[PDB]
PDB file of C-alpha atoms and ligand atoms in Angstrom:
ATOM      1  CA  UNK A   1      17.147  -8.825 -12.834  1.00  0.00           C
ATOM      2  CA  UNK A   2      15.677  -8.312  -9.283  1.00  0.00           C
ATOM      3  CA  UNK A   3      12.560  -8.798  -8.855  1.00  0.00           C
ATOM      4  CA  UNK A   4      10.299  -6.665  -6.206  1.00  0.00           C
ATOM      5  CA  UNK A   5       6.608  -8.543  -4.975  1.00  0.00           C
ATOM      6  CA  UNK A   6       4.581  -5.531  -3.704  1.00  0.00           C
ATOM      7  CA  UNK A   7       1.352  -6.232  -2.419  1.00  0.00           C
ATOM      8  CA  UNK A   8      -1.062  -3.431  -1.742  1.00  0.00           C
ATOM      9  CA  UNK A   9      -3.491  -3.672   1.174  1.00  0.00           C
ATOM     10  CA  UNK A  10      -6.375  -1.619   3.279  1.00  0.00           C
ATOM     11  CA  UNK A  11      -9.925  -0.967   3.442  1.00  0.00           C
ATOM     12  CA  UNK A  12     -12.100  -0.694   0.994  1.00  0.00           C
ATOM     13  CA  UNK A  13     -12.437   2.573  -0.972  1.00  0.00           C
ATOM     14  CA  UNK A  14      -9.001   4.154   0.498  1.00  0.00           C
ATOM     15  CA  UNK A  15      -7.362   3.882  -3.118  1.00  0.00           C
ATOM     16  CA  UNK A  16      -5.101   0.776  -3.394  1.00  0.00           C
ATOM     17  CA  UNK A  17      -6.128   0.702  -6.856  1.00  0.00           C
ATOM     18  CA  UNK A  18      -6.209   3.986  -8.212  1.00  0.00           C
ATOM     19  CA  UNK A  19      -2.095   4.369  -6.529  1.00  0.00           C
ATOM     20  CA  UNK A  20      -0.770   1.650  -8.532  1.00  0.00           C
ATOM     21  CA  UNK A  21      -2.772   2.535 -12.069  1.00  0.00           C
ATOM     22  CA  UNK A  22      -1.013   6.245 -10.960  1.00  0.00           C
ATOM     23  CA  UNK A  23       2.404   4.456 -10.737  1.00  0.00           C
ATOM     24  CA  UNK A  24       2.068   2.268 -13.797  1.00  0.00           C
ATOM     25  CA  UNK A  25      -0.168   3.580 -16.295  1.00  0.00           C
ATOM     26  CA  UNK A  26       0.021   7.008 -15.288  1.00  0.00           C
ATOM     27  CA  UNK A  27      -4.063   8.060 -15.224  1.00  0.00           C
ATOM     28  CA  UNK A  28      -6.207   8.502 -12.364  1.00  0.00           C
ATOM     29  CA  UNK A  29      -8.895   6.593 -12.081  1.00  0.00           C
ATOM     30  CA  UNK A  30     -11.984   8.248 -10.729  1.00  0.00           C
ATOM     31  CA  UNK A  31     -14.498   5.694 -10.827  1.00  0.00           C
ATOM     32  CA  UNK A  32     -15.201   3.005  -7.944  1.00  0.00           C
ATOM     33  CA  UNK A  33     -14.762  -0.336  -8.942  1.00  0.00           C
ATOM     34  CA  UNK A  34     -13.949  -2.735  -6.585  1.00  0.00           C
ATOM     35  CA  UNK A  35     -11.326  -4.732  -6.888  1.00  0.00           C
ATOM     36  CA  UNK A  36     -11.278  -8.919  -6.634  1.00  0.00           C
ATOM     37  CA  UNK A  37      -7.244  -9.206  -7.032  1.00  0.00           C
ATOM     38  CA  UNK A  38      -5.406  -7.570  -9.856  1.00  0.00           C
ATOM     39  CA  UNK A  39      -2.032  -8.310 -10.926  1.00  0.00           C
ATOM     40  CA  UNK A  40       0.724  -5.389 -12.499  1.00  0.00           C
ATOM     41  CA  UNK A  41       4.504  -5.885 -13.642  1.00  0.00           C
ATOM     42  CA  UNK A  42       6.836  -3.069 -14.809  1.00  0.00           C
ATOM     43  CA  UNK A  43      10.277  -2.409 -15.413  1.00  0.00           C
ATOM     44  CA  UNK A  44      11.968   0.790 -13.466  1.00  0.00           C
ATOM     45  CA  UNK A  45      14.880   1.699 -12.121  1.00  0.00           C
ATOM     46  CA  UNK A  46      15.055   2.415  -8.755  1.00  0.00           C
ATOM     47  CA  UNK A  47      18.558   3.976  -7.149  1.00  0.00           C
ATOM     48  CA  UNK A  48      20.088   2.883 -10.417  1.00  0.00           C
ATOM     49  CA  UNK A  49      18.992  -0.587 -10.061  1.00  0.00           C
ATOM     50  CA  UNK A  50      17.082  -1.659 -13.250  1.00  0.00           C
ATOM     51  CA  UNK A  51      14.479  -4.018 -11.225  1.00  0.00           C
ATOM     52  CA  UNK A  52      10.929  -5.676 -12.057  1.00  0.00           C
ATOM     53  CA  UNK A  53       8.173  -4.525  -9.692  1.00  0.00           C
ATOM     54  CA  UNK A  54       5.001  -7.433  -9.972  1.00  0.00           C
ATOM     55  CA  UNK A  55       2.448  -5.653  -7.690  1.00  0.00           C
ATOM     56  CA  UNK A  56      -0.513  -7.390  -6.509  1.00  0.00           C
ATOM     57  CA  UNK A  57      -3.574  -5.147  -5.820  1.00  0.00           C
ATOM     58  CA  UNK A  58      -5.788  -6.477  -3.506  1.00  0.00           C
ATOM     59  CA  UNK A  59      -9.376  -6.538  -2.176  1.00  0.00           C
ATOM     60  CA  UNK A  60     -10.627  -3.971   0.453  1.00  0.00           C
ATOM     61  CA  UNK A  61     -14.173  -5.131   0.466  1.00  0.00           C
ATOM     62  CA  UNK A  62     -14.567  -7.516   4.033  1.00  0.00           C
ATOM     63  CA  UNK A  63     -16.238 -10.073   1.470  1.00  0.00           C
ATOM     64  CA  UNK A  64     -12.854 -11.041  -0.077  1.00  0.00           C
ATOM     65  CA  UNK A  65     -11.091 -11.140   3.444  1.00  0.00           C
ATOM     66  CA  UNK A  66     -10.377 -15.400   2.839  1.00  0.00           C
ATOM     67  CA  UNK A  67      -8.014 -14.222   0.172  1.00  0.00           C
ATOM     68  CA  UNK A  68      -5.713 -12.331   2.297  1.00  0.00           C
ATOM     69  CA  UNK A  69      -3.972 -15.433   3.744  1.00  0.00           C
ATOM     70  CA  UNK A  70      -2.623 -16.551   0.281  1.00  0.00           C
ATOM     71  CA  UNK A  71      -1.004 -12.886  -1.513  1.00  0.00           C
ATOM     72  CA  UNK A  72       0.258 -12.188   2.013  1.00  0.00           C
ATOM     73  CA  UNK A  73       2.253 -15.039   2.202  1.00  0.00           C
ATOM     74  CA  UNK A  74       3.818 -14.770  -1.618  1.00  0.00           C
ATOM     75  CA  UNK A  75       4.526 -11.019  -0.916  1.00  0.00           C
ATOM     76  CA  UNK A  76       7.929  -9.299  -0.277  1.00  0.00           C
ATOM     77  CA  UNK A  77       6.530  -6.075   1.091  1.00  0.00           C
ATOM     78  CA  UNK A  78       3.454  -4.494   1.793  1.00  0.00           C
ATOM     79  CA  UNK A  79       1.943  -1.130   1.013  1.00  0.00           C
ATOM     80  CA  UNK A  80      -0.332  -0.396   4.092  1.00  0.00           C
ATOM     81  CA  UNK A  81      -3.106   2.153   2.623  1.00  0.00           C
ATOM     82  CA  UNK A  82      -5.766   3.792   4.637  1.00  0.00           C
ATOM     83  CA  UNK A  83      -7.608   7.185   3.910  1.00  0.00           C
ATOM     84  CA  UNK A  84      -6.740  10.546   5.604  1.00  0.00           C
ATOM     85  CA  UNK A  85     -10.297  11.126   5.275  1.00  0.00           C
ATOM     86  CA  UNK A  86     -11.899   7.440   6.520  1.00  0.00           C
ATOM     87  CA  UNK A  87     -10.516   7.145  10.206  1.00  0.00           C
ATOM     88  CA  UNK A  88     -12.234   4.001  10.275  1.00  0.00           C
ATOM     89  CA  UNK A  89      -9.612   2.758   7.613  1.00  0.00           C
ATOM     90  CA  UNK A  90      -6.895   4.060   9.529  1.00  0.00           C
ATOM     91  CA  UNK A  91      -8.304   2.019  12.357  1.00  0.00           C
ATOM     92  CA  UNK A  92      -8.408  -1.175   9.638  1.00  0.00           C
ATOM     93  CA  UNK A  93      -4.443  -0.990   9.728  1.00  0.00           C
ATOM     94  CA  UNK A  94      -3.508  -2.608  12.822  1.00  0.00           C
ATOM     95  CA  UNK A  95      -5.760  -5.771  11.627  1.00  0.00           C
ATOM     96  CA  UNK A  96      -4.168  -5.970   8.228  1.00  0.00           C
ATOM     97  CA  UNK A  97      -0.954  -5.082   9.547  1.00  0.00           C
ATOM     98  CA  UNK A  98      -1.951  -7.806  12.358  1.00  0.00           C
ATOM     99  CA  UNK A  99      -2.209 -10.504  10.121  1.00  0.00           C
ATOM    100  CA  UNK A 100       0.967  -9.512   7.924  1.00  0.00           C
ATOM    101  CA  UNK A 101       3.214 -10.863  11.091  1.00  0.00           C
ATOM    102  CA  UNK A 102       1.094 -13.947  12.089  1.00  0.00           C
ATOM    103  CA  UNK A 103       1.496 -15.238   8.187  1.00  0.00           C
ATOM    104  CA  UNK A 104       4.775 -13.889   7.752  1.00  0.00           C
ATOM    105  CA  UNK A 105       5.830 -15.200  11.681  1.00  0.00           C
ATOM    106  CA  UNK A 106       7.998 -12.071  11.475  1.00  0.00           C
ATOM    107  CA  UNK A 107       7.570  -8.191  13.334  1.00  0.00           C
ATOM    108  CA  UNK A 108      10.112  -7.292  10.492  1.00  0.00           C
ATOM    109  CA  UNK A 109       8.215  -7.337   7.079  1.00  0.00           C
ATOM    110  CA  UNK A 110       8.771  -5.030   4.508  1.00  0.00           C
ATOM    111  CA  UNK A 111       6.038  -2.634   5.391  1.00  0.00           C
ATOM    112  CA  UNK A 112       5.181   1.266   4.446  1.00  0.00           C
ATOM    113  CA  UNK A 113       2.040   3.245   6.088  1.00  0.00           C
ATOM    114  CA  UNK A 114       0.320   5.628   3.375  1.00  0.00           C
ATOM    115  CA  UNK A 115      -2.175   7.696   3.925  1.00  0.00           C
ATOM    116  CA  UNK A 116      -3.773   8.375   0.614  1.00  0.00           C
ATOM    117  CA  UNK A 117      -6.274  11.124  -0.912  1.00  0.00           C
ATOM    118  CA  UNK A 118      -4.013  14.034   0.559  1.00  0.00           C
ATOM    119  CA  UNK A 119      -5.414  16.629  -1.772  1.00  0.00           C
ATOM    120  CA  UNK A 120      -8.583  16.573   0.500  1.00  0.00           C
ATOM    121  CA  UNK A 121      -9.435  18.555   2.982  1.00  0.00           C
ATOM    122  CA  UNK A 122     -12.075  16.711   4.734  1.00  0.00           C
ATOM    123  CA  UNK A 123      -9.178  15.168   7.175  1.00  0.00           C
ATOM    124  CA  UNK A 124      -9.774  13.170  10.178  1.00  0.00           C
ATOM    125  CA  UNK A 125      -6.381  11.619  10.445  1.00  0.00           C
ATOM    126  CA  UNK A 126      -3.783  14.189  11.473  1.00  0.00           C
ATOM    127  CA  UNK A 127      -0.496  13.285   9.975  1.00  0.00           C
ATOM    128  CA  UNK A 128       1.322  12.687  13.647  1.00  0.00           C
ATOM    129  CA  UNK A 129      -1.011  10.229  13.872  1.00  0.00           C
ATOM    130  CA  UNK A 130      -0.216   8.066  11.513  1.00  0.00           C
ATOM    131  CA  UNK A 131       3.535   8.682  12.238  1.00  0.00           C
ATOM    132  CA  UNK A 132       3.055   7.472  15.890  1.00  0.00           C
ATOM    133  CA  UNK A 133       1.461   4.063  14.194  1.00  0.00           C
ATOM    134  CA  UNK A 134       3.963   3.877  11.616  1.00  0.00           C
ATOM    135  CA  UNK A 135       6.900   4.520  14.246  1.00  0.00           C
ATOM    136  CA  UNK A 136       5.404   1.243  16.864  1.00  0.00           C
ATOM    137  CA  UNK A 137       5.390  -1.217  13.592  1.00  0.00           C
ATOM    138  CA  UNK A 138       9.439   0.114  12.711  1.00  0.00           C
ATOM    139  CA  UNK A 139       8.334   1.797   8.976  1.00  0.00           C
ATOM    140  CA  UNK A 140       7.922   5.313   7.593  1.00  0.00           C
ATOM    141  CA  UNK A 141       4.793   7.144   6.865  1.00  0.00           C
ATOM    142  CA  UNK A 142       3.845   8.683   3.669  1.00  0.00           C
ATOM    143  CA  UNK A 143       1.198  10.751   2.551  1.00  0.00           C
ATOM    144  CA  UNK A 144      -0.011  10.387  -1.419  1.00  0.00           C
ATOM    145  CA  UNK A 145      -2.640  11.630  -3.830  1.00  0.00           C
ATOM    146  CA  UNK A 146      -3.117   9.181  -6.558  1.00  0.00           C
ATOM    147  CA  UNK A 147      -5.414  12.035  -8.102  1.00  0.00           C
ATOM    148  CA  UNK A 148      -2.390  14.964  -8.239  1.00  0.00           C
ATOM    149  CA  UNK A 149       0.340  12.253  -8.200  1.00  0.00           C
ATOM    150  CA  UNK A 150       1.812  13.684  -4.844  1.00  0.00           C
ATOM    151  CA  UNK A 151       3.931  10.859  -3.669  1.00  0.00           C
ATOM    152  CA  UNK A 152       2.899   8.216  -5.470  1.00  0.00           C
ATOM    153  CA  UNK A 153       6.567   6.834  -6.801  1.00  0.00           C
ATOM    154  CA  UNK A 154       7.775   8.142  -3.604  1.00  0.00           C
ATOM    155  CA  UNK A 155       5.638   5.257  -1.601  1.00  0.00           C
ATOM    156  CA  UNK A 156       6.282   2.563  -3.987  1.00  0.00           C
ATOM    157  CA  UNK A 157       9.937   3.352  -4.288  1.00  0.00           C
ATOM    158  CA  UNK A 158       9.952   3.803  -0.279  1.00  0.00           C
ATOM    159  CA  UNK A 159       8.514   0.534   0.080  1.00  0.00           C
ATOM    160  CA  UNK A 160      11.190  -0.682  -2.700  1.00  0.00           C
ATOM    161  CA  UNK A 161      13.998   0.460   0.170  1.00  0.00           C
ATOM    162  CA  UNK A 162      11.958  -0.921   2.702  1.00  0.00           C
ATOM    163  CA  UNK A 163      12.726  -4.726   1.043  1.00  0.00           C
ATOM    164  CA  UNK A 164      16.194  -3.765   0.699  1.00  0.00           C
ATOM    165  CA  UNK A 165      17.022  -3.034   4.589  1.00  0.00           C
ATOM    166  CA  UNK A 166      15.175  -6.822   5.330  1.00  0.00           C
TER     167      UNK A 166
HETATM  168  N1  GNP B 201      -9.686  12.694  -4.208  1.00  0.00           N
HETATM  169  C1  GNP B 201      -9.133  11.479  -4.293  1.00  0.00           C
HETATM  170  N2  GNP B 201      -9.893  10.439  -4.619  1.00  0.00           N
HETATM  171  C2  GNP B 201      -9.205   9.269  -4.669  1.00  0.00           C
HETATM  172  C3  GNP B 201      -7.864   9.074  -4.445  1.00  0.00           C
HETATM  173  N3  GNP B 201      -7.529   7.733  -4.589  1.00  0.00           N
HETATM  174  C4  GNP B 201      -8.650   7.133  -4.903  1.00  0.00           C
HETATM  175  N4  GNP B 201      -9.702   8.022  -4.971  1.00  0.00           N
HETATM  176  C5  GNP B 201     -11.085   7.702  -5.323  1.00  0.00           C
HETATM  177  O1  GNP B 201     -11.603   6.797  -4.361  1.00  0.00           O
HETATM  178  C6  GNP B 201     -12.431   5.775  -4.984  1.00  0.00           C
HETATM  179  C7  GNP B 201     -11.888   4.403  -4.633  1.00  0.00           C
HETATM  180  O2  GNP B 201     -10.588   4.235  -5.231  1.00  0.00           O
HETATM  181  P1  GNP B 201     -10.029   2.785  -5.511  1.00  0.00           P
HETATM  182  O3  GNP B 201      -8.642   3.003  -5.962  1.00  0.00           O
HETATM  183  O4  GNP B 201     -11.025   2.053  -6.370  1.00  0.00           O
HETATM  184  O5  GNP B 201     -10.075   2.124  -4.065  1.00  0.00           O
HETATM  185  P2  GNP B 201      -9.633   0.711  -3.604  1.00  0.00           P
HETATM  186  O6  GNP B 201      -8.863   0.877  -2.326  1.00  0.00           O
HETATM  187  O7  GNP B 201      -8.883   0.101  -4.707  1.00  0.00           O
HETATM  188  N5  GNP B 201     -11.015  -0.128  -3.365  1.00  0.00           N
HETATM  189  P3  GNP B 201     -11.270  -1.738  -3.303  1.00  0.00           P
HETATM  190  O8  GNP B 201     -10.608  -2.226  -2.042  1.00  0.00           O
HETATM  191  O9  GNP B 201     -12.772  -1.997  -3.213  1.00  0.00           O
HETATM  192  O10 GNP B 201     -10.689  -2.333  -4.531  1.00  0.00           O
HETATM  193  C8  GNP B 201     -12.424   6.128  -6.471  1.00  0.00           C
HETATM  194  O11 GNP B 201     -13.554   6.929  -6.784  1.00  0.00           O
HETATM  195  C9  GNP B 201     -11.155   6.952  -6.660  1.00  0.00           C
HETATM  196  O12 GNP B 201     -11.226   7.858  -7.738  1.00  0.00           O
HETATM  197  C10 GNP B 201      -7.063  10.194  -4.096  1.00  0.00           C
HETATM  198  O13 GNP B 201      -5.844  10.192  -3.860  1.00  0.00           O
HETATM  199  N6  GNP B 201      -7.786  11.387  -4.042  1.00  0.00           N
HETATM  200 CA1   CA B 202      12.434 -11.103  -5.208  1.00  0.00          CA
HETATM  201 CA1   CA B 203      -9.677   9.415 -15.105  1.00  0.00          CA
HETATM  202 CA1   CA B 204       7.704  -4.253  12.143  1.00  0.00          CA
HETATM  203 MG1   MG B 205      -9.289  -1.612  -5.812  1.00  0.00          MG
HETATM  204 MG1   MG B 206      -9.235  13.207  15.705  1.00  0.00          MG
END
């Protein structure tokens, strides 16, 4: 069957891992550990297509940053994460998103924006936004909550789509 590499990147703290337990194990995790590089398969169907998702989760702590080069280059599309509340992750985008398309040599990779931890209130990232970035890399914006589950399959599944227009 097909198989989908999704690799999950951003800042430290915005919630790359606590989105993919949410998609895969179905739990929220409400702890902080950070994350080294963690690796997740599953079988789904998505759009009737019974597919294997193998989604790397990666480091958003600046001390890991030498491991970038390698999962970005093995990946098939990329889940960009930042925080609605943590502009400076938002900010953090453009660099990750940055090196994407100097590994990749492309300004077409697979690619969705998410803006995670929508079920707070402290925002300092206004949802147009994020649009306007998403819109000047070519990829839709999504807002999630891996603690209420809002959107969580619908970013994974987006980025899923996202593969299969490349
Ligand atoms: N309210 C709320 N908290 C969230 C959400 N997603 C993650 N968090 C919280 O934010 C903290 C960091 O989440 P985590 O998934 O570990 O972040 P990360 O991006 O994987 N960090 P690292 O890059 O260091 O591995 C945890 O306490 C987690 O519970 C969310 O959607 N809403
Ligand atoms: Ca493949
Ligand atoms: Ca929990
Ligand atoms: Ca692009
Ligand atoms: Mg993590
Ligand atoms: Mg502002």
């Amino acid at each position: 069957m097909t198989e989908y590499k999704l690799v999950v990147v951003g800042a430290g703290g915005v919630g790359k891992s606590a989105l993919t337990i949410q998609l895969i194990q179905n739990h929220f995790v409400d702890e902080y550990d950070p994350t080294i590089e963690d690796s997740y398969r599953k079988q789904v169907v998505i759009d009737g297509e019974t597919c294997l998702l193998d989604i790397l989760d990666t480091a958003g702590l600046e001390e890991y940053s030498a491991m970038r080069d390698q999962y970005m280059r093995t990946g098939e599309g990329f889940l960009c994460v930042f925080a609605i509340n943590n502009t400076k992750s938002f900010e953090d985008i453009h660099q990750y998103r940055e090196q994407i398309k100097r590994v990749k040599d492309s300004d077409d990779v697979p690619m969705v924006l998410v803006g995670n931890k929508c079920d707070l209130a402290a925002r300092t990232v206004e949802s147009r936004q994020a649009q306007d970035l998403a819109r000047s890399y070519g990829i839709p914006y999504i807002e999630t909550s891996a603690k209420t589950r809002q959107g969580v399959e619908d970013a994974f599944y987006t980025l899923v789509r996202e593969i299969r227009q490349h």
